[PDB]
Amino acid sequence: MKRTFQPSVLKRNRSHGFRARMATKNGRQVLARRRAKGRARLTVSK
Amino acid sequence: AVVKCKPTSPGRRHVVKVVNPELHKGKPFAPLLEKNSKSGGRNNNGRITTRHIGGGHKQAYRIVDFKRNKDGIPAVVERLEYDPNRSANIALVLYKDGERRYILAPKGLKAGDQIQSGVDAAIKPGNTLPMRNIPVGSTVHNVEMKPGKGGQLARSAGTYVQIVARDGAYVTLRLRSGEMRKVEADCRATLGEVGNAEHMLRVLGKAGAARWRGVRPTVRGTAMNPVDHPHGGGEGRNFGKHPVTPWGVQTKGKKTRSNKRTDKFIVRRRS
RNA sequence: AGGACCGAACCGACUAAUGUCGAAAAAUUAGCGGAUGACUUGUGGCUGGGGGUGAAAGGCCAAUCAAACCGGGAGAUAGCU
RNA sequence: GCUCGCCGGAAGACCAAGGGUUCCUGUCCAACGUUAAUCGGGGCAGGGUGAGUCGACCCCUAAGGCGAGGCCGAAAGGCGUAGUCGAUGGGAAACAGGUUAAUAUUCCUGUACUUGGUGUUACUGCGAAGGGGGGACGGAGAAGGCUAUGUUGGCCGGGCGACGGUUGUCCCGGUUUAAGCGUGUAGGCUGGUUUUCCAGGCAAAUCCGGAAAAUCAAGGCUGAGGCGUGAUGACGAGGCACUACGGUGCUGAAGCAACAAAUGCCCUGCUUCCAGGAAAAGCCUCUAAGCAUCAGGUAACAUCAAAUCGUACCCCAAACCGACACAGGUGGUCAGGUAGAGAAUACCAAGGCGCUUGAGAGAACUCGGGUGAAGGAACUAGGCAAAAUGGUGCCGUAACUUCGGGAGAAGGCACGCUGAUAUGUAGGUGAGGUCCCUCGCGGAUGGAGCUGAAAUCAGUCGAAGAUACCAGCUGGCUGCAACUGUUUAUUAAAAACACAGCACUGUGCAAACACGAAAGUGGACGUAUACGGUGUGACGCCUGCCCGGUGCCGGAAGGUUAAU
RNA sequence: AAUUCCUUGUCGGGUAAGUUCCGACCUGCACGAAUGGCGUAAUGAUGGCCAGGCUGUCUCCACCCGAGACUCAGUGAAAU
RNA sequence: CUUUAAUGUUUGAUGUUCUAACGUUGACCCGUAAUCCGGGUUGCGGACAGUGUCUGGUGGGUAGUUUGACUGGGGCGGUC
RNA sequence: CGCGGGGUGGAGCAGCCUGGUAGCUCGUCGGGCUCAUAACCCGAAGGUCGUCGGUUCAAAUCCGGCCCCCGCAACCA
């Protein structure tokens, strides 16, 4: 079969990355809630 | 000249190609070419605004001098060329001062004939001049609408409009569709008629024959489901409804003309 | 020259058998169609929920679609079990 | 360690993606491994990834994204100019041998190249976000010239051999060499040079383009491979010698010729047809605003710099995605021998594996298959499944037909090996000799050698000669749909969809129409031989009657008629 | 008839036997001329029918070679 | 009261002409290497077009809902 | 089996909705026009209103049973 996960780290960071999240208003609320819940690895990064 | 191909294969038995050895068999004038990345019917938001458009072959852009701003300058029609974007031919015209410019190729024209523009040009196909300097009843094309805009009317293959009269300030024309539109005397026109009239006799023959041209397959309304179109549904292609567009607007007879800002221009409407 | 022919790669997936708590949350084997084209494919982008996209089946949209998933209205309502 | 077996256009060797030490060594066996385990991708401790020339970072951009002002919008925010990012694209430069338990186009040895900085000597006018050229490009086909590579012969070295022959037309092994430089070829492109003038290229211009004279006939550009050099260097089968018996150290002959021939290269070619096939920078060059005893540019030499990061291992899989050590999926390059048209297939070379449960029994029954007396579809919803035809050349081939097809129709004949034609022919290739020359990688002539189909005849062997793998069932009538194509990913691939063609109708362009509160865009940098929608679905023959009902269009006098 | 309910209508062909097929008769429950009609060479992993060839489909199954099934040793589920 | 006649006066409905509102997805220039935009010239239309408010009409394109019960199962029929 | 409609001179159809009165065309008979027929012209005749019964002053009409004909329905498993 052809599963639904063909990894490519560049695409992983251009749609879910830190600077991609910071690019919008609602995106900033995402990073806010992550810090609200007290998560160590906020978003997908190195 | 046209040609009906011999049935050497299924699908090929109907094709008709319009050929003319006048066309330069090589690469065009590069300095007047710019790119043209397509759209496929997608706007700024990317939504498909118009259907059936997309695909096709990569085409370059040939800048055509519609302003015809050169004045009182002799020009030799160097070599006729093939143009992707349009339906007619485009002639590479070389001027006396050494400035090469592309222009829409009319009928009465060959690789080596003389032309000129301005208000002093003679009455020969290819010559451009304001409509108040052209005799009543003649043939012209590439007719402008606004003074110095460039040209809006009759630019396609085998297309020409006929000046019906000239009442002082206004110049009445009989458009290609069959209108009676008044255009100001400051607008330039090109005498003669656009060449390659057999374009309308062109038969594609293949499904892909329209594919690489840019056309994508259309889906009939009766074949779809009641959600995606006002038509569709039922058991066995029933219709029972007045034919409309995919957005409920009545088709097959319905004036959608709503301008009113330029209704003083059109004297008689289309037949 | 050919949306040409036979036929590998490659793509697709008509028939049967096995498989059905399988090796596998649609696979394998033995036969199959296309195979210079409306072909196929890697990478990189783009369109989004009453919308997107669709050679149009109401198919597909992260195994979920006649309206996805996550959280909040909300301990919804329930003459029902 | 010795045999057997298996893949071999992969189950081989290398990269990207993505993983993240899974690589190596020592040590250990509880847990992981579907069994034991002193074994391992498992634990613990340690080691290993060395770059000016590879890639990325960098320069320059495409799709597309963001976006100073600005347009617009309850707010959020949407769009977009200047600019700035963004490769999967273009742009400078390195190859051979050796070396580790593990990395090396990175280390070492040998031999070179690329772009800048500074300084000096000798000349000389340089110089932009500006102009021009270049970069720079489509699909297919045929041919010519070569290479990787392979085969044979020569040469060199070893052997002459556990059952009969085997010093001979015998057998086995090796016969390798790049980057760069010099030369500039087969082939390909274009007529050069000098002078004058110009509303031309946002201004200018000696650069390009164009318009006229002139002189001479070639010059110039581009370009695989070959020949020298690189290189009396390395490598090299095999010996010579120490063993912790893993391998280390020393030494080292031949190293040519011919033929066949790529999907590789010349080719980013040439021809043809059409659906007519990116951008910008690096680079070359001309000038503006200016600056000139300056400054800079060209050339040569010397010297310095070339920074940062990745570099292990896996890479068609026990390490990626699939919950697993999962018969699935995963892009790119190299890709040999014999037979063969071939990357099919068959058996093997290089290399790597025997798939992490086995040992016996040989029941029904189940799965994968083999063969089968007589009959031959009586099976059954139905010839589903099997069986069968199956290759090349020649003979031969109907109804019908859009004159292409139908058609590889059907149905048949000849196929091994040996010798002869011919101590291997037609043909391909091609050295020496001879001759000429605008003397070189030249052109004729010349024919050794190498290599090599098919046809014909005769003879002989088997039951069977396309003896294997591989490899069409055919014909007749007919419904439906024209045809290739597309779809229910994962029970329906069709008579459904699309289709070219046809028709009606809407739209005169700030167009109809569509998304969007708006702006702005798509439509189109197109314009009625165009574009949107709808309906039918090649082509041939046609396509009749009805305007009452519903809708649409045209005409508005009168009745009625909201707000005011 | 992809349309025909009645119906397996009637007639002729094909078979020893034909509700299917093929060619016609028109009695069209309820075909019909771009929600296109009637034909058509080529084409179809399409529907239906017949013949030849071919064979284990079958009459009626038989034997044999492999992988399980059984036994021994180790590990060790499941639905209910 | 009806028919009518000149004038003053009160406005409405049309025709025509003009430029200053406004539009300008025409040409030119500048901010500026910038097809955005804005300002200044000029040409063309022109008190139209367009926008807002109120309002008539059309309108399944879109949204929220009804779509009865008994019934010797429900539907049809029939009843209330 | 149910719903609705219909049955009228010899034939084909109105009149029924809202009970006292039945029409049109063709056809038939007889005469006339022509030498003869049809057509044309003129005049007259012909209806137990499917059947029985009833409510009613009065029934073709309004209701009930029955007969025949026509269309629709006769369903989902």
PDB file of C-alpha atoms (C1' of nucleotides) in Angstrom, chain A residues 1 3-5 8 10-11 14, chain C residues 24 26-27 43-45 62-63:
ATOM      1  CA  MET A   1       0.000   0.000   0.000  1.00  0.00           C
ATOM      2  CA  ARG A   3       0.500   5.020   3.421  1.00  0.00           C
ATOM      3  CA  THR A   4      -0.343   8.658   4.197  1.00  0.00           C
ATOM      4  CA  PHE A   5       3.051   9.801   5.474  1.00  0.00           C
ATOM      5  CA  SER A   8      10.019  15.652   3.935  1.00  0.00           C
ATOM      6  CA  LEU A  10      11.256  20.987   4.652  1.00  0.00           C
ATOM      7  CA  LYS A  11       7.511  20.647   4.070  1.00  0.00           C
ATOM      8  CA  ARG A  14       6.885  25.241   6.085  1.00  0.00           C
TER       9      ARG A  14
ATOM     10  C1'   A C  24      -1.095  -7.361   4.732  1.00  0.00           C
ATOM     11  C1'   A C  26      -8.039  -4.789  -0.341  1.00  0.00           C
ATOM     12  C1'   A C  27      -2.432  -8.494  -0.513  1.00  0.00           C
ATOM     13  C1'   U C  43      10.727  17.569  -5.957  1.00  0.00           C
ATOM     14  C1'   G C  44       8.278  22.551  -4.625  1.00  0.00           C
ATOM     15  C1'   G C  45       4.061  25.204  -4.200  1.00  0.00           C
ATOM     16  C1'   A C  62      -4.285  11.913   6.056  1.00  0.00           C
ATOM     17  C1'   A C  63      -7.585   4.354   6.447  1.00  0.00           C
TER      18        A C  63
END
